[PDB]
Design a protein around this motif. Structure first.
Motif, PDB file in Angstrom:
ATOM      1  N   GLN B   4       0.864  -1.215   0.000  1.00 56.60           N
ATOM      2  CA  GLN B   4       0.000   0.000   0.000  1.00 56.60           C
ATOM      3  C   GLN B   4       0.887   1.247   0.000  1.00 56.60           C
ATOM      4  N   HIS B   5       1.903   1.259  -0.818  1.00 59.77           N
ATOM      5  CA  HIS B   5       2.810   2.440  -0.862  1.00 59.77           C
ATOM      6  C   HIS B   5       2.099   3.618  -1.533  1.00 59.77           C
ATOM      7  N   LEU B   6       2.830   4.649  -1.857  1.00 55.90           N
ATOM      8  CA  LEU B   6       2.209   5.837  -2.506  1.00 55.90           C
ATOM      9  C   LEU B   6       3.168   6.391  -3.562  1.00 55.90           C
ATOM     10  N   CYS B   7       3.396   5.644  -4.611  1.00 56.39           N
ATOM     11  CA  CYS B   7       4.324   6.113  -5.677  1.00 56.39           C
ATOM     12  C   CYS B   7       3.575   6.200  -7.010  1.00 56.39           C
ATOM     13  N   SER B   9       0.685   7.640  -8.435  1.00 52.29           N
ATOM     14  CA  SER B   9      -0.582   8.396  -8.232  1.00 52.29           C
ATOM     15  C   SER B   9      -1.473   7.634  -7.251  1.00 52.29           C
ATOM     16  N   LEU B  11      -1.168   7.897  -4.077  1.00 55.06           N
ATOM     17  CA  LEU B  11      -1.223   8.673  -2.805  1.00 55.06           C
ATOM     18  C   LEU B  11      -2.637   9.202  -2.579  1.00 55.06           C
ATOM     19  N   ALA B  14      -4.266   7.455   0.059  1.00 57.26           N
ATOM     20  CA  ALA B  14      -3.897   7.799   1.459  1.00 57.26           C
ATOM     21  C   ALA B  14      -4.667   9.054   1.866  1.00 57.26           C
ATOM     22  N   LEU B  15      -4.631  10.061   1.039  1.00 54.33           N
ATOM     23  CA  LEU B  15      -5.356  11.319   1.349  1.00 54.33           C
ATOM     24  C   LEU B  15      -6.863  11.054   1.432  1.00 54.33           C
ATOM     25  N   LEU B  17      -8.301   8.828   3.168  1.00 56.04           N
ATOM     26  CA  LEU B  17      -8.595   8.581   4.607  1.00 56.04           C
ATOM     27  C   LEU B  17      -8.611   9.919   5.347  1.00 56.04           C
ATOM     28  N   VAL B  18      -7.898  10.889   4.838  1.00 55.41           N
ATOM     29  CA  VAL B  18      -7.867  12.222   5.504  1.00 55.41           C
ATOM     30  C   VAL B  18      -9.300  12.700   5.742  1.00 55.41           C
ATOM     31  N   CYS B  19      -9.979  13.111   4.708  1.00 52.80           N
ATOM     32  CA  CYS B  19     -11.381  13.575   4.875  1.00 52.80           C
ATOM     33  C   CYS B  19     -12.290  12.687   4.024  1.00 52.80           C
ATOM     34  N   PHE B  24     -10.276  16.859  -0.139  1.00 56.56           N
ATOM     35  CA  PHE B  24      -9.034  17.511   0.371  1.00 56.56           C
ATOM     36  C   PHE B  24      -8.474  18.440  -0.701  1.00 56.56           C
ATOM     37  N   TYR B  26      -6.139  18.194  -2.757  1.00 58.49           N
ATOM     38  CA  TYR B  26      -5.135  17.366  -3.479  1.00 58.49           C
ATOM     39  C   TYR B  26      -4.606  18.119  -4.697  1.00 58.49           C
TER      40      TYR B  26
END
Lengths: 21, 29
Positions: B4-7, B9, B11, B14-15, B17-19, B24, B26
């Motif tokens: 579950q990396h973020l390389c 696109s 990511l 991950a963002l 889960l932020v809102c 967000f 982005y």
């Protein structure tokens, strides 16, 4: 620092919470 | 190596889960 910079791991999601709207 | 990396696109996930609902700012530079 919101691009794919986080690639050496998964980056704390809570840390990205500040980017929320 | 499919973690579950973020390389590239992945990511935005991950963002998510932020809102997520509210969304967000982005605007990756």
């Amino acid at each position: 620092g919101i691009g794919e910079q986080c690639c050496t791991s998964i980056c704390s999601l809570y840390q990205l919470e500040n980017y929320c709207n | 190596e499919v973690n579950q990396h973020l390389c590239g696109s992945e990511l935005v996930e991950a963002l998510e889960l932020v809102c997520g609902e509210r969304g967000f700012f982005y605007e990756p530079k």
